[PDB]
Design a protein around this ligand. Structure first.
Ligand SMILES: CCCCCCCCO[C@@H]1O[C@H](CO)[C@@H](O)[C@H](O)[C@H]1O
Ligand SMILES: CCCCCCCCO[C@@H]1O[C@H](CO)[C@@H](O)[C@H](O)[C@H]1O
Ligand SMILES: CCCCCCCCO[C@@H]1O[C@H](CO)[C@@H](O)[C@H](O)[C@H]1O
Ligand SMILES: CCCCCCCCO[C@@H]1O[C@H](CO)[C@@H](O)[C@H](O)[C@H]1O
Ligand SMILES: CCCCCCCCO[C@@H]1O[C@H](CO)[C@@H](O)[C@H](O)[C@H]1O
Ligand SMILES: CC(C)C[C@H](N)C(=O)O
Ligand SMILES: [Cl-]
Ligand SMILES: [Cl-]
Ligand code: NA
Ligand code: NA
Length: 507
């Protein structure tokens, strides 16, 4: 099997796994929609009860499976629970990454397209005071990029440049992955992670220099970091906080497990996982949290910045921030650094959610790496056409795989690992090779607190929110549901094909 060459390269590839578009696009939206500081308290708690333990559990599962030549959950779940239903539950560990990748790479390709257009100065020209006259040209710029529907039909019509930049973006992701783990994902993380930290800090600095009649960047920092204990009783904030923690640390996407299956059997995972998790949080709450919201609060005030964040998941990042930057000297180049930052943010994360499908093809179907990467890309490139052309197809995928699915699968992999396999055998397998040991209190969090926390959460979804999504959406949502359900069917057939190759090989 292939291995991470260096300790540092493993951490940067794991941090590059986690530090992505969620740090800089999703976290600002999720924080502002939910009252700023009121969001932080459930966010910090969820990090301590959910994010940290699941990080360790997935590192253990990956490394455990990797010592037996398996990197994906269809095989690893069976290694933990010898039962066909573990193989079937394991398909989610391929389905969730592949579904999420279908829409993540596309959004990643926007930032590459926006970066190119901002670098070359092919950007809108706001008329030099009215905010709408400054924002509308950038709303119209993004809407023309992805092709937001102008009539009644739910059809997207992306620009030719967007589609070509998507092909370019895929080609960029293939070029890294086809070189492997050590000569591909690892080498690129040693380059991208410094680049990304540098850019973010500079932007944080430049945003902190913003002052207008409506406020300063400190006003956004106070809004984000001022508690509001009157919201701790809202199931929505807790749902939003735990869903963010999952998304940001790459938990429930089968990606950490696959990356961890390339860690040598003896090597530490306790300090490693903690560092990468600690890295991703600094990336959000310090860097991601200090760019979008302070800048939006700085030009518009808190209430309008909150209103901007509630308008959509991309308004703040693809419309508001460049519009804000367009009012400052060299703001076009500042936009380029912003969208170039997002491109390495997503690229280090898109290669992470595409490695599982590759690993499954190499490990379980014995495909060469070249063929495993290329077939994986072909699967993503084709499938992405559903996200590109059907309005709100992206949303449905992010909900079922990137929102519901990761919390379901996260609870699934904890029970399989830490209950069925055995809590004590799991505790042993987490701490083995540990440069440090997992604190004794976390054994009781993993066995009892975390699974009940998620169980209650998933029950609040299933009763109070999902009924609106099964009955109050446009009929076209079943087009995406049908496709992603058939995608699951296809992956199980591969699993079935992988256990039949294993019966003929042993014979
Ligand atoms: C069922 C279709 C399977 C894949 C066919 C993809 C067709 C891509 O079509 C292309 O889309 C671009 C963006 O709108 C346009 O700029 C081009 O005119 C068009 O050739
Ligand atoms: C990174 C290189 C990407 C090259 C994409 C070329 C897409 C060409 O596309 C064309 O470009 C013209 C000039 O801007 C536009 O007027 C047209 O709308 C567009 O069809
Ligand atoms: C669900 C994935 C398939 C959707 C992409 C299909 C691309 C359709 O292609 C479209 O054909 C039209 C007439 O032929 C042209 O007006 C457009 O230029 C072109 O975008
Ligand atoms: C999943 C649905 C997304 C598909 C994108 C629809 C592209 C709309 O393109 C349509 O293609 C039709 C057949 O070629 C033509 O009759 C029309 O000229 C054209 O409007
Ligand atoms: C619910 C999650 C709590 C996370 C905070 C744990 C802080 C670690 O706590 C420490 O753990 C050590 C090893 O068990 C002990 O030696 C110390 O008594 C204890 O202070
Ligand atoms: C699906 C994951 C790779 C997402 C990534 N952890 C992010 O925060 O952007
Ligand atoms: Cl364009
Ligand atoms: Cl219709
Ligand atoms: Na993240
Ligand atoms: Na990343």
């Amino acid at each position: 099997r292939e291995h991470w060459a260096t300790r540092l390269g493993l951490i940067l590839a794991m941090a590059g796994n986690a530090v992505g578009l969620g740090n800089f696009l999703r976290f600002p939206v999720q924080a502002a929609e939910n009252g700023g500081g009121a969001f932080m308290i459930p966010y910090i708690i969820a990090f301590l009860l959910v994010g940290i333990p699941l990080m360790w559990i997935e590192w253990a599962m990956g490394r455990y499976g990797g010592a037996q030549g398996h990197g994906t959950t269809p095989a690893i779940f069976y290694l933990l629970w010898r039962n066909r239903f573990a193989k079937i539950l394991g398909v989610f560990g391929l389905w969730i990454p592949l579904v999420v990748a279908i829409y993540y790479v596309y959004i990643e390709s926007w930032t590459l397209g926006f970066a190119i257009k901002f670098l070359v100065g092919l950007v809108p020209e706001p008329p030099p005071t009215d905010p709408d006259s400054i924002l509308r040209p950038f709303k119209e710029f993004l809407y023309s990029y992805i092709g937001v529907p102008k009539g009644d039909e739910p059809i997207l019509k992306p620009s030719l440049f967007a589609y070509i930049v998507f092909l370019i973006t895929m080609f960029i992701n293939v070029s890294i992955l086809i070189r492997g783990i050590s000569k591909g994902i690892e080498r690129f993380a040693k380059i991208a992670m410094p680049t990304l930290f540098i850019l973010a800090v500079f932007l944080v600095i430049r945003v902190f220099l913003l002052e207008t009649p409506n406020g300063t960047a400190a006003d956004g920092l106070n809004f984000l970091w001022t508690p509001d204990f009157e919201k701790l009783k809202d199931p929505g904030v807790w749902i939003a906080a735990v869903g963010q923690i999952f998304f940001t640390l790459s938990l429930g996407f089968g990606a950490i497990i696959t990356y961890a299956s390339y860690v040598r059997k003896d090597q530490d995972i306790v300090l490693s996982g903690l560092t990468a998790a600690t890295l991703n949080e600094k990336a959000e709450v310090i860097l991601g949290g200090s760019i979008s919201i302070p800048a939006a609060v700085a030009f518009f005030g808190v209430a309008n910045a909150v209103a901007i964040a509630k308008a959509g998941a991309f308004n703040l990042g693809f419309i508001t921030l460049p519009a804000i930057f367009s009012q400052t000297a060299g703001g076009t180049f500042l936009g380029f650094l912003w969208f170039f930052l997002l491109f390495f943010a997503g690229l280090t994360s898109s290669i992470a959610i595409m490695q599982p499908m590759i690993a499954f093809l190499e490990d379980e179907l014995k495909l060469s790496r070249k063929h495993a990467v290329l077939w994986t890309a072909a699967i993503v490139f084709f499938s992405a056409h559903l996200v590109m052309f059907l309005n709100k197809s992206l949303d449905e995928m992010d909900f079922w795989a990137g929102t519901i699915g990761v919390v379901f699968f996260g609870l699934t992999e904890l029970i399989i690992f830490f209950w069925i396999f055995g809590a004590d055998k799991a505790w042993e397998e987490i701490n083995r090779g540990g440069i440090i040991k997992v604190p004794r209190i976390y054994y009781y969090v993993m066995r009892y607190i975390t699974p009940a926390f998620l169980a209650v959460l998933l029950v609040v979804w299933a009763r109070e929110y999902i009924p609106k999504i099964m009955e109050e959406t446009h009929w076209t949502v079943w087009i995406t549901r049908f496709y992603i359900i058939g995608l699951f069917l296809f992956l199980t057939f591969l699993v079935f094909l992988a256990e039949r190759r294993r019966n003929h090989e042993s014979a």
